[PDB]
Short mmCIF file of C-alpha atoms and ligand atoms in Angstrom, two decimals:
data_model
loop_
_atom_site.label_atom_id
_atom_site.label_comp_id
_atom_site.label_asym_id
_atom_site.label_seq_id
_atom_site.Cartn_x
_atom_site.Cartn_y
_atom_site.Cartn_z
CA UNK A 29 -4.16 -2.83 56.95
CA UNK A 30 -3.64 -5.89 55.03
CA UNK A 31 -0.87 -6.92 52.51
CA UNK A 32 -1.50 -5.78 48.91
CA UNK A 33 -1.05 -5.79 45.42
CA UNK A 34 -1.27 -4.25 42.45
CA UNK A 35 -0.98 -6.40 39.38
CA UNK A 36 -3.55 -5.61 37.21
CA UNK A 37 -5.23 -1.97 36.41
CA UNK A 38 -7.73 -0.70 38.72
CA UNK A 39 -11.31 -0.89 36.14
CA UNK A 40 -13.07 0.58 39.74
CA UNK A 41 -13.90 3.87 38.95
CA UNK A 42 -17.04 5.31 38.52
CA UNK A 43 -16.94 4.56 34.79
CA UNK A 44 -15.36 2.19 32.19
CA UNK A 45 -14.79 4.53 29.82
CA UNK A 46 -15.58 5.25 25.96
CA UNK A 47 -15.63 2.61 23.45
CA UNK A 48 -15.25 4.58 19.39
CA UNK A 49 -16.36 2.54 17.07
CA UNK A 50 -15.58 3.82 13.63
CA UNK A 51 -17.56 1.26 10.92
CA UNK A 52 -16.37 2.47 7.71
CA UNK A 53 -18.52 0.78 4.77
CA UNK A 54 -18.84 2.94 1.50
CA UNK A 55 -15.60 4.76 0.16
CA UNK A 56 -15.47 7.16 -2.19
CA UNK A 57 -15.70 6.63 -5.98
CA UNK A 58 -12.37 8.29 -6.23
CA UNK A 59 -10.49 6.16 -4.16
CA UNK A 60 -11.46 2.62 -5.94
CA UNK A 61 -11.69 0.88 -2.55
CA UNK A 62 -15.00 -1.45 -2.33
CA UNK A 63 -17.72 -1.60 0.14
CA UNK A 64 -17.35 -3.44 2.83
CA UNK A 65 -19.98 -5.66 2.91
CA UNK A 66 -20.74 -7.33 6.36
CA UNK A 67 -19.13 -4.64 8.50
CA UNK A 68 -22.44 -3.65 9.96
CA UNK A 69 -22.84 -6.79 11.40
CA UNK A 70 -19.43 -6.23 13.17
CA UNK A 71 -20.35 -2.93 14.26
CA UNK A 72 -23.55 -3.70 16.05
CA UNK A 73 -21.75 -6.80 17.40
CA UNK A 74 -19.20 -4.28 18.87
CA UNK A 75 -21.79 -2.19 20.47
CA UNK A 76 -23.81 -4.93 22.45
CA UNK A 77 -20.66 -6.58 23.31
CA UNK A 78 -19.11 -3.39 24.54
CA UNK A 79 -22.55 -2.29 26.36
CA UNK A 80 -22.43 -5.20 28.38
CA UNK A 81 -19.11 -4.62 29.51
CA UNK A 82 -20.51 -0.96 30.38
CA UNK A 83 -18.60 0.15 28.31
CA UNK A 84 -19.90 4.30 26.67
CA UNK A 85 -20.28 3.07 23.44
CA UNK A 86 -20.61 5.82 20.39
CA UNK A 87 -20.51 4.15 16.78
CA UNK A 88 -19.64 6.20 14.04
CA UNK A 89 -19.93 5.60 9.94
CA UNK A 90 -18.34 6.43 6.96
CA UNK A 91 -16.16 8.92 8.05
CA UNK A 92 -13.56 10.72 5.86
CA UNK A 93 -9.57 10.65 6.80
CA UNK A 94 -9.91 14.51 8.18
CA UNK A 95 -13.25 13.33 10.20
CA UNK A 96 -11.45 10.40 11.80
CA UNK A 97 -8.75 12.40 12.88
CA UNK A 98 -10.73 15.05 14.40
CA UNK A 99 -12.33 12.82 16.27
CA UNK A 100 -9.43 11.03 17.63
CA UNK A 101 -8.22 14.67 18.70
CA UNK A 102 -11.23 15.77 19.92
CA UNK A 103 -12.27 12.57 22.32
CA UNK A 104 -7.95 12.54 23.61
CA UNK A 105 -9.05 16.32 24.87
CA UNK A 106 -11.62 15.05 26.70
CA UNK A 107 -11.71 14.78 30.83
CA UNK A 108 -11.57 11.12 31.14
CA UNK A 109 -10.24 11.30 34.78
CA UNK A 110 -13.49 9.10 36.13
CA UNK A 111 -13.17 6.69 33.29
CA UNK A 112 -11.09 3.53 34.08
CA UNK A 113 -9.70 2.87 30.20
CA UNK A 114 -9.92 3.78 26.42
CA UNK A 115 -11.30 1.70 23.83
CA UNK A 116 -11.58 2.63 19.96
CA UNK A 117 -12.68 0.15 17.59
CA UNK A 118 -11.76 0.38 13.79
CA UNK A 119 -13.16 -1.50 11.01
CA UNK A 120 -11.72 0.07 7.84
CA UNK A 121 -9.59 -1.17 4.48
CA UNK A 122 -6.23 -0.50 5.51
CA UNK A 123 -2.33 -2.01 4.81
CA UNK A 124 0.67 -2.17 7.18
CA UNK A 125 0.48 1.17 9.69
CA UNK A 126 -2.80 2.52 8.25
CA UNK A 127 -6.29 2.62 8.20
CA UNK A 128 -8.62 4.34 5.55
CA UNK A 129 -10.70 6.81 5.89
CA UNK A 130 -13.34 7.09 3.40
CA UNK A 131 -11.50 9.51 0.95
CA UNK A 132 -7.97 8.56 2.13
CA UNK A 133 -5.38 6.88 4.54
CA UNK A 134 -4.66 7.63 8.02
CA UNK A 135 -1.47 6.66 9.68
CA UNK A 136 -2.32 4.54 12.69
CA UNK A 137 0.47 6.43 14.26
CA UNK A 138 -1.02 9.42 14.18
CA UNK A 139 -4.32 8.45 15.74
CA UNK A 140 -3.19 6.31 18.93
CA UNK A 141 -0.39 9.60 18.70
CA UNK A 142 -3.32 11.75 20.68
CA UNK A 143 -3.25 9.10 23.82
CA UNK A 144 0.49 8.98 24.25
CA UNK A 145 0.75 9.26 28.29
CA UNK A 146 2.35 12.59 27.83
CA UNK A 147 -0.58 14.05 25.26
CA UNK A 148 -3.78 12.80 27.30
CA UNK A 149 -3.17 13.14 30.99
CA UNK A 150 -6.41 11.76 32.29
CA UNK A 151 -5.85 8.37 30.45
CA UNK A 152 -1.87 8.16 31.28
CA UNK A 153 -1.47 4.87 33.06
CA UNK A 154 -4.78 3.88 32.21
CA UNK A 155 -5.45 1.02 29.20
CA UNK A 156 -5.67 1.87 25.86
CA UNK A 157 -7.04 -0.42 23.71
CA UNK A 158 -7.30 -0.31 19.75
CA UNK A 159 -8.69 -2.59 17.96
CA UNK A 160 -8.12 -3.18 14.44
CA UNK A 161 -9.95 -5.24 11.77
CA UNK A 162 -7.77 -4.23 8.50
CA UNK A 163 -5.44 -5.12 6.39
CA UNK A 164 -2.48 -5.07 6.82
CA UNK A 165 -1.06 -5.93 3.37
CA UNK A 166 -1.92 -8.28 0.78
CA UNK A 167 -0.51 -11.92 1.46
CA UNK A 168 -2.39 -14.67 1.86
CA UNK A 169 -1.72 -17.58 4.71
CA UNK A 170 -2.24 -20.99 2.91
CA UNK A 171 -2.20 -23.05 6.08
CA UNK A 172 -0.81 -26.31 7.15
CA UNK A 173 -2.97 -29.68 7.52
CA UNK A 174 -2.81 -30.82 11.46
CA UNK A 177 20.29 -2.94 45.15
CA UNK A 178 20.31 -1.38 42.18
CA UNK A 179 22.48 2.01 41.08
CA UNK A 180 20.13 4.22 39.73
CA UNK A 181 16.27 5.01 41.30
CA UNK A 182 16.11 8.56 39.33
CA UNK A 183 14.76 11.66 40.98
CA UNK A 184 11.43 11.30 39.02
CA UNK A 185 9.30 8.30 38.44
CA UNK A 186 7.83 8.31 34.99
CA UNK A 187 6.55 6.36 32.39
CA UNK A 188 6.94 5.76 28.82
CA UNK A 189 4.40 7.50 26.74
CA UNK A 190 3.71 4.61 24.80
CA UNK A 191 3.23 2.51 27.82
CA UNK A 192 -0.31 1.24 28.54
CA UNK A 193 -1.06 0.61 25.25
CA UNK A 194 -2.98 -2.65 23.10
CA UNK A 195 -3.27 -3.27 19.60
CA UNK A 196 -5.66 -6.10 19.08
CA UNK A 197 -4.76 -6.38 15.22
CA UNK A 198 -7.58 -8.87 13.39
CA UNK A 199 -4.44 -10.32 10.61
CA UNK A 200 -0.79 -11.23 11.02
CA UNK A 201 1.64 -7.89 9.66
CA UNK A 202 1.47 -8.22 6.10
CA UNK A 203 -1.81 -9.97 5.74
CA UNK A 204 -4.88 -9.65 4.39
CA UNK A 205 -7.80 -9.82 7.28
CA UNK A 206 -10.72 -11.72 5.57
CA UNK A 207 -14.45 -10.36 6.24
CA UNK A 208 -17.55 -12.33 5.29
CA UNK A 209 -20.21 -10.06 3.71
CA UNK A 210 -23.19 -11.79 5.50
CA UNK A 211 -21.23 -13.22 9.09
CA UNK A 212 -19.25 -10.54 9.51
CA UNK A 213 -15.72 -10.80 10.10
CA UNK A 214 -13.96 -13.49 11.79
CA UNK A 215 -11.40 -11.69 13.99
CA UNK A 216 -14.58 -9.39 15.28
CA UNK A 217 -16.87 -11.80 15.38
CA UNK A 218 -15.03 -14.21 17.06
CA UNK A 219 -13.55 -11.34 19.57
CA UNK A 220 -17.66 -10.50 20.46
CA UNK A 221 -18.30 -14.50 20.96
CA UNK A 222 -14.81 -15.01 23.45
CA UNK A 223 -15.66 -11.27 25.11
CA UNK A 224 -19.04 -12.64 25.82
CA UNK A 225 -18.52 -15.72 27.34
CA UNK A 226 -14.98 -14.95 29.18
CA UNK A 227 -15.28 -11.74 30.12
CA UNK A 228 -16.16 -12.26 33.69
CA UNK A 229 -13.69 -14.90 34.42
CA UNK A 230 -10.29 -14.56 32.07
CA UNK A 231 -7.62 -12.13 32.20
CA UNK A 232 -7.99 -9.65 28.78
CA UNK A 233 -4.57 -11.06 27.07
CA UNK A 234 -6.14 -14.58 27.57
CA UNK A 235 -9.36 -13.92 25.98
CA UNK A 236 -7.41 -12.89 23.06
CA UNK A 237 -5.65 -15.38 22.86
CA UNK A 238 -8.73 -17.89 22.62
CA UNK A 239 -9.65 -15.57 19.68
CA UNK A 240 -6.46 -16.26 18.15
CA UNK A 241 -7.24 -20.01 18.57
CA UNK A 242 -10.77 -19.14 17.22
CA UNK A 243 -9.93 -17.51 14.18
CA UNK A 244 -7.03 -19.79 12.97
CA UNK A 245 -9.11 -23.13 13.39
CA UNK A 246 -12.37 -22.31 12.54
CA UNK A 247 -12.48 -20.48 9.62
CA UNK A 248 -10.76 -21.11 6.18
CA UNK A 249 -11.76 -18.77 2.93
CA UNK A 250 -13.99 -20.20 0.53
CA UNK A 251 -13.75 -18.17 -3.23
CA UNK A 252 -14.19 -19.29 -6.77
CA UNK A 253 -10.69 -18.31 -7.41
CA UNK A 254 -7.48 -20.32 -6.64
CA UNK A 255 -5.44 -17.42 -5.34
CA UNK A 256 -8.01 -16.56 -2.86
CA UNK A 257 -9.77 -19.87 -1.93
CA UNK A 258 -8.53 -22.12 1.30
CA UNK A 259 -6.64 -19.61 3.14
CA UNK A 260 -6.35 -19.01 6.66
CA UNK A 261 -5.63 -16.31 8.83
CA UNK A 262 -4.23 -15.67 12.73
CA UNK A 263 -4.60 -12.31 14.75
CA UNK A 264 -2.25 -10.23 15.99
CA UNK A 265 -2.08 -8.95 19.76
CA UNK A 266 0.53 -6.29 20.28
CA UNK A 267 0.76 -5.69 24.00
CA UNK A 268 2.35 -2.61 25.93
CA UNK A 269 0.26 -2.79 28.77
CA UNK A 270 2.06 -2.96 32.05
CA UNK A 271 -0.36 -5.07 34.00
CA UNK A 272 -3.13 -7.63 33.80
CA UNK A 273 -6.54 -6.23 32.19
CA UNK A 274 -10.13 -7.67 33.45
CA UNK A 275 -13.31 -6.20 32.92
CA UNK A 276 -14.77 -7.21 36.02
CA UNK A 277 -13.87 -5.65 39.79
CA UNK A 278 -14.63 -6.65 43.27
CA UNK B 2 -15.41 -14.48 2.00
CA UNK B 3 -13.71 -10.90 0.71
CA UNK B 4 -10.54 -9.09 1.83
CA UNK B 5 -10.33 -5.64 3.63
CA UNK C 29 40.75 6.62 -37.98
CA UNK C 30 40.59 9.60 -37.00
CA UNK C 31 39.07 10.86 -33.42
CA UNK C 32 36.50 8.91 -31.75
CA UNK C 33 34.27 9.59 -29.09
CA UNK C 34 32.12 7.16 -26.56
CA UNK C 35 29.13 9.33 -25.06
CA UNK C 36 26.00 7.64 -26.54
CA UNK C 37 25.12 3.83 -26.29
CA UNK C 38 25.28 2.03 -29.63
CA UNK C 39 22.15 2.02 -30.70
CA UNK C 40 22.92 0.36 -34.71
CA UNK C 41 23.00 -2.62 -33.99
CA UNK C 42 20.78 -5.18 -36.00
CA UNK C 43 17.68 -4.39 -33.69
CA UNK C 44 16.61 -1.76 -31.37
CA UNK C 45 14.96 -4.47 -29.30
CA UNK C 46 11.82 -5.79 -27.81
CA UNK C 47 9.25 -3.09 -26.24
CA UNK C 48 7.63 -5.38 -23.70
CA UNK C 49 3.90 -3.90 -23.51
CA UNK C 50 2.08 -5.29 -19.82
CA UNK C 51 -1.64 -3.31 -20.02
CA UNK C 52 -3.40 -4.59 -16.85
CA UNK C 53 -7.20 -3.25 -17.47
CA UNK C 54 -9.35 -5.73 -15.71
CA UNK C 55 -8.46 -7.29 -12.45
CA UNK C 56 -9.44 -10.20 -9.96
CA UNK C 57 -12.39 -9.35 -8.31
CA UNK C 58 -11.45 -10.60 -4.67
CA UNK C 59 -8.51 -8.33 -4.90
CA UNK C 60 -11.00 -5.12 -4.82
CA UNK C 61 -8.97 -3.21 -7.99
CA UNK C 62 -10.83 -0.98 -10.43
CA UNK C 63 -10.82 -1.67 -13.80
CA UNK C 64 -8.33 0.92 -15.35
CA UNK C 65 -10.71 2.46 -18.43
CA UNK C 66 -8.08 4.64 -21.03
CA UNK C 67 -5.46 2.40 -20.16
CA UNK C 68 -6.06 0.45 -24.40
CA UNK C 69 -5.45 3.73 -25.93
CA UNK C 70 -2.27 3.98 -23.86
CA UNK C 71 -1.08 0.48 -24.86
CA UNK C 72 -2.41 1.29 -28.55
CA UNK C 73 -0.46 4.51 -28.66
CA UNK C 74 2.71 2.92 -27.54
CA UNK C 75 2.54 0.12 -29.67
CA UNK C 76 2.36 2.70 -32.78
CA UNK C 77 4.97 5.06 -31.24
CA UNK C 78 7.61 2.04 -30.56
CA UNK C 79 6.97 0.40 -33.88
CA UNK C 80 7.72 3.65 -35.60
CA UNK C 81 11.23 3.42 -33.48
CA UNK C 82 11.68 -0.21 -35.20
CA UNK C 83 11.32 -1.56 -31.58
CA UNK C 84 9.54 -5.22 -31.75
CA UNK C 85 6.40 -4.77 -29.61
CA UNK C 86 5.02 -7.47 -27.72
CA UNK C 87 1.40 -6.48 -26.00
CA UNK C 88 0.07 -8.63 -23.11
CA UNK C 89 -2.79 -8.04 -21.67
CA UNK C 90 -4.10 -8.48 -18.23
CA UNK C 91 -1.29 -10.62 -16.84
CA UNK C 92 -1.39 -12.37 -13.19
CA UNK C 93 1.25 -11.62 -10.70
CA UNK C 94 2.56 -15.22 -11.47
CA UNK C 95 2.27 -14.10 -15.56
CA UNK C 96 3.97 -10.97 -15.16
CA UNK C 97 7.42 -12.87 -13.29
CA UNK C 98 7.33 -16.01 -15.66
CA UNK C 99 7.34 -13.07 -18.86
CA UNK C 100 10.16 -11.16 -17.59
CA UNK C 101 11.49 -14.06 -16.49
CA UNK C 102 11.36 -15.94 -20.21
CA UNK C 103 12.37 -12.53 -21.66
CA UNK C 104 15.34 -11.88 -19.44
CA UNK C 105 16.91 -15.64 -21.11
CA UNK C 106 16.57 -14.55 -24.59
CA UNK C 107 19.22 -13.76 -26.88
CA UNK C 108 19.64 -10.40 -26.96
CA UNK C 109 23.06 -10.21 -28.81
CA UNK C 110 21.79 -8.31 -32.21
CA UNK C 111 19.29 -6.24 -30.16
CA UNK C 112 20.39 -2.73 -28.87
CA UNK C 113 18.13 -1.91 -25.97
CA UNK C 114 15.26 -3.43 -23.82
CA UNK C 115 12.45 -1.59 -23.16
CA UNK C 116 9.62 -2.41 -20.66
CA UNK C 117 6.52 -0.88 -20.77
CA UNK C 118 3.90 -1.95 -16.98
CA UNK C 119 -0.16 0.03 -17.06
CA UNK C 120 -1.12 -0.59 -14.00
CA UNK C 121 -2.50 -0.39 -10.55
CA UNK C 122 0.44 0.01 -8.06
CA UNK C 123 1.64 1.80 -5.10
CA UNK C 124 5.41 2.84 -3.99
CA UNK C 125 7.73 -0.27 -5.19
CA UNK C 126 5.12 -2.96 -6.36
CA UNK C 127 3.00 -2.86 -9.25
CA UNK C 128 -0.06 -4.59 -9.59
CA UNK C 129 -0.91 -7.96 -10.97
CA UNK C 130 -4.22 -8.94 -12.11
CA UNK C 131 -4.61 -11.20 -8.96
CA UNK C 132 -2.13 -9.38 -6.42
CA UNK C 133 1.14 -6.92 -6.13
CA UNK C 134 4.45 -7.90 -8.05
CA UNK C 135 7.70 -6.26 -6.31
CA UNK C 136 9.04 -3.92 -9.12
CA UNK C 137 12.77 -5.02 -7.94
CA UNK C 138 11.79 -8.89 -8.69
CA UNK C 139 11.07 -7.92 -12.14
CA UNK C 140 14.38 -5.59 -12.81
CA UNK C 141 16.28 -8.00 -11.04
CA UNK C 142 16.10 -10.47 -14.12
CA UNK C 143 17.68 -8.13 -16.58
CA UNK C 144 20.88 -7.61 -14.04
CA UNK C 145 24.25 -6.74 -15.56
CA UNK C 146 24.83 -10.03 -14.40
CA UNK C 147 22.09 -11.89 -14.68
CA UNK C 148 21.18 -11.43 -18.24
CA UNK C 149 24.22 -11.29 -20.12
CA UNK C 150 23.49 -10.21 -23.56
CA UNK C 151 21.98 -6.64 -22.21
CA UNK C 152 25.07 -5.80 -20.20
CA UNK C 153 26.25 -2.05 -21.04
CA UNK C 154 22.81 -1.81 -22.85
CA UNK C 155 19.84 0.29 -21.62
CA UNK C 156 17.60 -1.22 -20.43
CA UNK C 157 13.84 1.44 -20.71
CA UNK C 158 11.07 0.78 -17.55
CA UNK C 159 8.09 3.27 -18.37
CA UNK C 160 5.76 2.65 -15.34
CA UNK C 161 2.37 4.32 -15.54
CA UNK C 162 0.67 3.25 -11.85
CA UNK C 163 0.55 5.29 -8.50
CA UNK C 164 3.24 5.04 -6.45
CA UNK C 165 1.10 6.02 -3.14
CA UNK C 166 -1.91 8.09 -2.40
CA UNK C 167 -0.74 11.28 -2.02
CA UNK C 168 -2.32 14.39 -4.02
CA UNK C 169 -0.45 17.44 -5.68
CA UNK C 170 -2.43 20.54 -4.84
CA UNK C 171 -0.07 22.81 -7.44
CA UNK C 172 0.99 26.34 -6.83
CA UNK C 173 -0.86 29.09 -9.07
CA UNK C 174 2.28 30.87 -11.98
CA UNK C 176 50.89 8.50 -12.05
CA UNK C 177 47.35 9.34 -12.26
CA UNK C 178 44.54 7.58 -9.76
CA UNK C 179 46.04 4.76 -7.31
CA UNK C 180 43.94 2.34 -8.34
CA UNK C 181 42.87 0.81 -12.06
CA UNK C 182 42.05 -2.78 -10.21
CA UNK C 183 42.89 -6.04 -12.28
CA UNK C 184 38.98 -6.51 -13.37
CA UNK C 185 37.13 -4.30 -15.74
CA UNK C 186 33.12 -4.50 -14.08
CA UNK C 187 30.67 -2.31 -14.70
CA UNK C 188 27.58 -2.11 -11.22
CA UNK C 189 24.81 -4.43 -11.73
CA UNK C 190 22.56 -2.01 -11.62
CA UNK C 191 23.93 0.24 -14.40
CA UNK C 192 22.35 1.25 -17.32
CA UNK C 193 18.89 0.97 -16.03
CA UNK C 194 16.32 3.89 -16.46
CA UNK C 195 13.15 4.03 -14.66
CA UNK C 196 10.51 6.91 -16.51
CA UNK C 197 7.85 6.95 -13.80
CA UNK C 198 4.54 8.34 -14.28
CA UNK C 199 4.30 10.40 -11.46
CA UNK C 200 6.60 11.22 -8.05
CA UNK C 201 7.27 8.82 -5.29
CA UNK C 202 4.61 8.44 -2.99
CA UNK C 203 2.16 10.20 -5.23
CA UNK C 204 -1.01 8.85 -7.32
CA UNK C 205 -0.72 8.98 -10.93
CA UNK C 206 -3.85 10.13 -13.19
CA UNK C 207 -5.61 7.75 -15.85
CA UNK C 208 -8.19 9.76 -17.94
CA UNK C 209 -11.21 7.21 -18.82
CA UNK C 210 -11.36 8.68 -21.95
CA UNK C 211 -8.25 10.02 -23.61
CA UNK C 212 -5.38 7.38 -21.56
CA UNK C 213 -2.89 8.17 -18.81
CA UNK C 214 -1.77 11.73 -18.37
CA UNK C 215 2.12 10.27 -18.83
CA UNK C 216 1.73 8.19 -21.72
CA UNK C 217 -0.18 10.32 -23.90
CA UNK C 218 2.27 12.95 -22.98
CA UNK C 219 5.28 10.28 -23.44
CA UNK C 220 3.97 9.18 -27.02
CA UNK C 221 3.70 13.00 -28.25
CA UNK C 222 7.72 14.15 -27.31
CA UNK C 223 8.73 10.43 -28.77
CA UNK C 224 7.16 11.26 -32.00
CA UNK C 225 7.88 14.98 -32.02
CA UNK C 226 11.50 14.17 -30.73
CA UNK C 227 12.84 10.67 -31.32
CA UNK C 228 14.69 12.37 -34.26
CA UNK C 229 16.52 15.04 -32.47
CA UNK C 230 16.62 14.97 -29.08
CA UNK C 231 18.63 12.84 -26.46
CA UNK C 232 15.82 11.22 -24.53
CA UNK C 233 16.62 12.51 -21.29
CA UNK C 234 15.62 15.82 -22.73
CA UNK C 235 12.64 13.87 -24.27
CA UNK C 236 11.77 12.53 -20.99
CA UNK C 237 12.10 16.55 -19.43
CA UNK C 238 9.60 17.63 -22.39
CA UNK C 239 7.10 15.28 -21.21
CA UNK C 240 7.81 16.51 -17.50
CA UNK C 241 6.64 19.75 -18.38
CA UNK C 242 3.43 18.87 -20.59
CA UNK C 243 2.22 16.84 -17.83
CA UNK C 244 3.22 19.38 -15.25
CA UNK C 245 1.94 22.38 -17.47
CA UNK C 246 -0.95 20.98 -19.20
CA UNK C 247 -3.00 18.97 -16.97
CA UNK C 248 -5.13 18.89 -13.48
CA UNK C 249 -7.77 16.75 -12.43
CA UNK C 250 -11.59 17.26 -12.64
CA UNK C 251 -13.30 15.55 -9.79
CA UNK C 252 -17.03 16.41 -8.40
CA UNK C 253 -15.21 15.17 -5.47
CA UNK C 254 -13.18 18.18 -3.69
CA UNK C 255 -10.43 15.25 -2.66
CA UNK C 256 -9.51 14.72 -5.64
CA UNK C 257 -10.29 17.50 -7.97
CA UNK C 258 -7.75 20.41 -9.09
CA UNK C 259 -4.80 17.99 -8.61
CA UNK C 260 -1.59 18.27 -10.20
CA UNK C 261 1.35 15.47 -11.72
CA UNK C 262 5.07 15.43 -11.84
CA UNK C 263 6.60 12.79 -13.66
CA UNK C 264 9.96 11.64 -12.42
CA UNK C 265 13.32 9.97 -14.19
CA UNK C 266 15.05 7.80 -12.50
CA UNK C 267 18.54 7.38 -14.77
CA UNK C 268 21.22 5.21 -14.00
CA UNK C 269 22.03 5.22 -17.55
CA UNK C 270 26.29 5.74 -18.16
CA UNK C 271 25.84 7.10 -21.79
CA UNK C 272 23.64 9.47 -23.76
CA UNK C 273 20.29 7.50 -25.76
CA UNK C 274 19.27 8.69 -28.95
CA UNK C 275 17.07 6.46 -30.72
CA UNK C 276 18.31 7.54 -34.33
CA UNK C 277 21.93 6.63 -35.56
CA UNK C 278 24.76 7.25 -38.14
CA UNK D 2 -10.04 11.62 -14.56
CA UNK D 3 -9.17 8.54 -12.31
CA UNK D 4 -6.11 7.53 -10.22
CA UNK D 5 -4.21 4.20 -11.22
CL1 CL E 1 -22.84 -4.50 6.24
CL1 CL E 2 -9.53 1.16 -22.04
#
């Protein structure tokens, strides 16, 4: 049989896998944080965008720090062993290394924690994807005008190998959201998935939602602090090989 | 436009 | 004379000193803060209880980030030669290090920073007061149910960050509680043991008193289990060098 | 009660 390789992560078996899409909108009195107007246009972006990809889509509002957790535990349990990759969506309030639930924070850690390679065996070497519109902090961005010794008697892999963290905002950021568009990482992340998906690699479609977000949009508010400011995305990559959504 |  | 002793900071000189007051109630709406209700009968009540210490009380009111560093900044250059302490007053939003601005977060150390040992000459070997009531994270207390030495160097310094006290509100990492209607748990708390104590106690055993009414006295009421039945710790952080009484002779 |  012919030469081959293996560059890129087999997306071949008999399902895609899960996409989680956690849309938190309303928080609790208690807390102070605002609605988060705009999000459901994000999360019904997601889901069409995601479905198309055939991708198991299951959205989820307005759930509380304990509920977000629980799920996160609950889905890593699962028997993904026919499912080619893992995709959870958030779209929350958040600041650097956490994401709110509606009564409370959640350390980001402790969610993608439950897919480490060692903790979920049927996703370990298998993509896992997160996807974060947050913030990640509170600055603004005001923009510019323009052989060998040792084999081992074991093969393994890191546990946090195989990992993505498509972050919407630079680390220390805000992540801006428009209350009737939606946001613009998201938004712009549906409009690049749906046109490149079937011909770019996944870490190049990002990357055109990078260019997306940082040339066409700019903040428009009534006040200074807030008003002409810009904003780039994030992609934190530990995959180990090239991601496409199409196979054959 | 509003922050998250 | 006879036999002196050096354990308490001289507090006779001509003044006791400014009591900056910074009472941030009302706050940018793109930032997404709540409006802090109670927080103008904690500035009232500290205005009243400093005065009645002969501190000179400055009140500002709902001060942007930029406000807030040009203040301390202005404040930090003043001659402070005839004035015994400084004390520094923020009611606020905040979280762990930063308190908040009307418009965004100020970084606590920026503002301390200004009044240095070295930096602001006229308060070295003074003490210099920070009473911060904002949360310092979002954490919840559930409670419990009841010759000689080798070396004297050639330079007599003193650290740069001596003589600094910082009475937080609440414990790192922890919210602090604002009632709507009577003020923050802390200040009300802080105002009582200054005006039941100011004339006999050191105030590190002030500050302890006020540890233990807020400890002992309060927990929150929520209709939201989250957040209801919570409990507060107040914590000093003292890098003071001498004892602080705010009486003399 | 509220939380600052
Ligand atoms: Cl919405
Ligand atoms: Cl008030």
């Amino acid at each position: 049989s012919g030469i081959s390789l293996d560059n890129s992560y087999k997306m071949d078996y008999p399902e895609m896998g899960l996409c989680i899409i956690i849309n938190n909108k309303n928080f609790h009195k208690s807390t102070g944080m605002t609605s988060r107007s705009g999000t459901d246009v994000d999360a019904a972006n997601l889901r069409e965008t995601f479905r198309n990809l055939k991708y198991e889509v299951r959205n989820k509002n307005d759930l509380t720090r304990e509920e977000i957790v629980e799920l996160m535990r609950d889905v890593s349990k699962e028997d993904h062993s026919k499912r080619s990759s893992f995709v959870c969506v958030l779209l929350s309030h958040g600041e650097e290394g956490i994401i709110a639930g509606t009564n409370g924070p959640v350390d980001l850690k402790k969610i993608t924690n439950f897919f480490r390679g060692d903790r979920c065996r049927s996703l370990t070497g298998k993509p896992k994807l997160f996807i974060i519109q947050a913030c990640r902090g509170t600055e603004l961005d005001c923009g510019i005008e323009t052989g060998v010794d040792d084999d081992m008697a074991c093969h393994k892999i890191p546990v946090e190998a195989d990992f993505l963290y498509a972050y919407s905002t630079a680390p220390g950021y805000y992540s801006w959201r428009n209350s009737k568009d939606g946001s613009w990482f998201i938004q712009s992340l549906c409009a690049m998935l749906k046109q490149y998906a079937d011909k770019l690699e996944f870490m190049h479609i990002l990357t055109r939602v990078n260019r997306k977000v940082a040339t066409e949009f700019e903040s428009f508010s009534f006040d200074a602090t807030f008003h002409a400011k810009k904003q780039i995305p994030c992609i934190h990559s530990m995959l180990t090989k090239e991601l496409y959504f199409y196979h054959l | 436009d509003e922050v998250d």
